[PDB]
Amino acid sequence: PQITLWKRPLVTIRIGGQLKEALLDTGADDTVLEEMNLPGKWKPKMIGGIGGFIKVRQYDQIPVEICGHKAIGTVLVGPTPVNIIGRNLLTQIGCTLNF
Amino acid sequence: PQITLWKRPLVTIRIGGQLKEALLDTGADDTVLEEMNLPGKWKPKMIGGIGGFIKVRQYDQIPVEICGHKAIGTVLVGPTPVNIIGRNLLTQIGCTLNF
Amino acid sequence: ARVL
């Protein structure tokens, strides 16, 4: 699809067999989701945003379906204000910015 | 143009008679620039993201050209680590997400 | 990792 930006680009994703809403975020290097359980091992990591740094759990090689498009990659879990799909998965679904 | 997302989508903007590098950020409601001494009236604002909130100065009706495409709107100035072009100006340049 |  083509998504305009008059409203936040929120979409439905499937992850760990659950549906969630997430924001397609070209300003994010990484995908970060609010607290939830994911299967498998995780490693502690830190990431930074506009307000400073937070601690997250890094899950690798996680399948995520985004508007019906398949990705498998790194998902960070922690105290983000909104679920965000970052460039690591945006690239996998062939997402570009156009103007 | 078409901007792929393998790297941070950094582009050249012109604002207040300065050329600057800025990140096209679909996850940002607002445009937030690194500290700069713009003339004009402003008011204080708090904006939030990963890590918490920062204090910024809100300037209205500021012309901003983004890769040759003219825009005019609200710009926030504060201790962001990177210049961020948010949806308020992305909509004005006809920017879409496409996959 | 930068997440704006």
Locate the chain A residue with the closest alpha carbon to C1: A47
Resolution (A): 1.9
Interface contact flag, B27 C4, Cβ < 8 Å? yes
Do the chains contact at A47 and C2, CB–CB below 8 Å?
yes
Task: Number of A to C CB contacts under 8 A, please give it.
Answer: 29
Active site residues of B: 25
Sign for the CA dihedral angle at B94, B3, A63, B27 comes to negative
Query: In whole angstroms, what is the distance from residue A26 CA to residue B9 CA?
Result: 7
Burial of residue B18, with CB atoms counted within 10 A of its CB: 0-12 exposed, 13-18 middle, 19 or more buried: exposed
If we measure between CA atoms, which residue out of B68, B77, B81 comes closest to residue B11? B68
Q: A–B: how many Cβ contacts below 8 A?
A: 133
Instruction: For residue A28, list chain C residues with Cβ-Cβ distance below 8 A.
Output: 2-4
Burial of B22 per CB tally in 10 Å (0-12, 13-18, 19+): buried
Scanning every residue of chain A, which has its alpha carbon at the shortest distance from the alpha carbon of B81? A50
- Which residues of chain B are within 8 Å of residue C2 when distances are taken between CB atoms? 8, 81-82
Burial A1-33 (b: 16+ CB within 10 A, else e): eebebeebbebebebbeeeeebbbbbbbbbbbb
Question: Experimental method used, please?
Answer: X-ray
CA separation, residue A77 to residues A46, B52, B77, B93 (Å): 11, 16, 29, 33
Our CA dihedral for A22, B73, B84, A84, rounded to 10 degrees, sits at 0
| Number of domains chain B contains | 1
CB contact under 8 A, C2 and B28: no
The parent domain of residue A35 ranges over 1-99
**Token output for B77:** 């100035």
CATH number at residue A52: 2.40.70.10
Contacts of C3 in chain A (CB under 8 A): 25, 27-30, 32, 47-49, 80, 84, 86
What is the Cα–Cα distance from B89 to A14, expressed in whole angstroms? 31
- Residue A59 to residues A7, A10, A56, A95: CA-CA distances in angstroms? 30, 22, 10, 22
Of the residues A25, A29, A30, A60, only one is catalytic, namely: A25
